[PDB]
Write a protein that binds this ligand. Sequence first.
Ligand SMILES: CC(=O)N[C@H]1[C@H]([C@H](O)[C@H](O)CO)O[C@](O)(C(=O)O)C[C@@H]1O
Ligand SMILES: CC(=O)N[C@H]1[C@H]([C@H](O)[C@H](O)CO)O[C@](O)(C(=O)O)C[C@@H]1O
Ligand SMILES: CC(=O)N[C@H]1[C@H]([C@H](O)[C@H](O)CO)O[C@](O)(C(=O)O)C[C@@H]1O
Lengths: 200, 201, 200
Amino acid sequence: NDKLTLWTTPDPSPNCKVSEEKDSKLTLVLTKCGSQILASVSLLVVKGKFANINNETNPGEDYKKFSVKLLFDANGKLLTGSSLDGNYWNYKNKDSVIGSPYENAVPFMPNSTAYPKIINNGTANPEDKKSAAKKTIVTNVYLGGDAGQPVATTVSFNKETESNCVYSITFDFAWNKTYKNVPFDSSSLTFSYIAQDAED
Amino acid sequence: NDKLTLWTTPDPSPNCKVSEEKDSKLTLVLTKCGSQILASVSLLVVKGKFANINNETNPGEDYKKFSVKLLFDANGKLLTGSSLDGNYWNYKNKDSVIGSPYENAVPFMPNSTAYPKIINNGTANPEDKKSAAKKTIVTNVYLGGDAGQPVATTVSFNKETESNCVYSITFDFAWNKTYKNVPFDSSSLTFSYIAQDAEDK
Amino acid sequence: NDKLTLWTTPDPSPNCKVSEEKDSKLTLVLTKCGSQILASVSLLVVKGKFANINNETNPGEDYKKFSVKLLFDANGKLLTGSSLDGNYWNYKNKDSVIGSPYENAVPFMPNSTAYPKIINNGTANPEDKKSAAKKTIVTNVYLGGDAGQPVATTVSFNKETESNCVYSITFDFAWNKTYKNVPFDSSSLTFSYIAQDAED
Ligand SMILES: CC(=O)N[C@H]1[C@H]([C@H](O)[C@H](O)CO)O[C@](O)(C(=O)O)C[C@@H]1O
Ligand SMILES: CC(=O)N[C@H]1[C@H]([C@H](O)[C@H](O)CO)O[C@](O)(C(=O)O)C[C@@H]1O
Ligand SMILES: CC(=O)N[C@H]1[C@H]([C@H](O)[C@H](O)CO)O[C@](O)(C(=O)O)C[C@@H]1O
């Protein structure tokens, strides 16, 4: 009933494509403390490529990394082409989701002044040079909650331009370890980014 | 606000068992940002095993790791099996604590739908309760605030079962380094977890 | 919103001294969720020592680390002697700043009970033993948002005593890598600390 938490469900049914359709349950919770967004996120791949990682028999790089994209329009609606199905992605209602799909959700989108879409011109003066890293959180999650099973995790904001998105949260994942029969089950990751809002 | 912050005191007197009774000050602050909980946490061992770590003379594993449990009931009261003494664990009032002990504190407990108590072992076709990792935050703290002194730190939610707990915040700590005369003084760690609600009315 | 979020601008003009004057844009956002402060922070060095790090030709330590201080008075005003210029450091209003400079900002300062001014200890009684680490967050940021480019990052609270400061947020940065032509462009870092104010 609180309008201040866009999320999946806390315990979601398969609602995310990783390597196929409905590959994986992605738990993502955006709580809007002031002008910033507090977010935790776990990923669990239940079937397909990364449901039981083995790089002993699959040493290839395509088997040692993947990416999850959330694509949003100017209203901040989740698009098709997002890795995340939008059926069970809405504002909170007890442990579940609100009856109607959400019309507007800009307050929750990354700031397009803080995290601008990169531009396609070559010239750039000292003060007018924009940043790639600014739009980035690089960290680790840990498969199975084992500290010896690190995945390099890269949250990116308004990185994507897919399906004519205006805002884009992107979780990239990669590892060096040659994991043997290790389900991709990520530890919860806490992070924040600066939001947008607009009047009318 | 004061009613939105369960914690110890900012500067607590020895209030945590690590290897023996009140042998460490644990600073923990739960602030309830919407449906999530924002938390920072430092640990300082003042006496006993880990008050001055040396693995040169104590190479044994029992001397290179330990765990601190907070056990809660369905109301969210701290239970006896807890590593943390409950005298100075309550809602905030200035840099101190509220007059009466707290009756209810569920809003602050980890979500038992997101972090369910029981774990399923063996088979995994559905795999629907099958996340161990979801209930986990793995990171590092740094003894003395020195970047060369990492402790592998594992926050767990509703992991524990002891004393008939319903909710359980659990901080495990372990290290590979052979530390020589290094007090266990952890750098403050920021983290969040998904909370619980309170029925309807 | 106003009074709830002390910050720079989301996209700041050069407003930070690192090795010389206004040689870097530092983006810092303090949002006061309850009794804690939520903060993200990116640093971008546009000119001078760290604008294009090379430790192949500059192996010296002075070229492999630096520190950024914010020094505050009892009111919580940013002082000269801070690395951060105070012109465009104020309470939020849209993507910009409030008209007048801010009179009071204690609610945003680190807790002087949790992070005491104490640093010299003459005795050390078991129950009255004070903590250095408590005042510390040690983590990593990642230059260019590349996971292979770690900087050891140390946030410290009420560490500093310079210019007779009462409160002090301090970001130290250091690296072991011998980086070749690597701009100091940090990935956004999320963190929190304890903060109070009270009076009549
Ligand atoms: C950083 C962290 O938290 N975990 C790390 C663990 C633990 O420190 C501990 O050694 C496990 O027992 O060590 C590694 O496996 C290692 O040294 O190769 C890297 C891993 O990232
Ligand atoms: C905060 C952090 O990650 N610190 C890490 C440092 C940094 O790389 C630092 O710059 C140089 O010590 O490296 C280690 O000391 C190391 O390799 O053994 C481990 C430690 O966890
Ligand atoms: C986010 C993270 O973990 N970064 C770390 C990377 C990643 O493992 C990366 O994927 C491989 O470059 O490893 C190091 O570069 C390394 O091994 O020396 C240290 C660095 O801090």
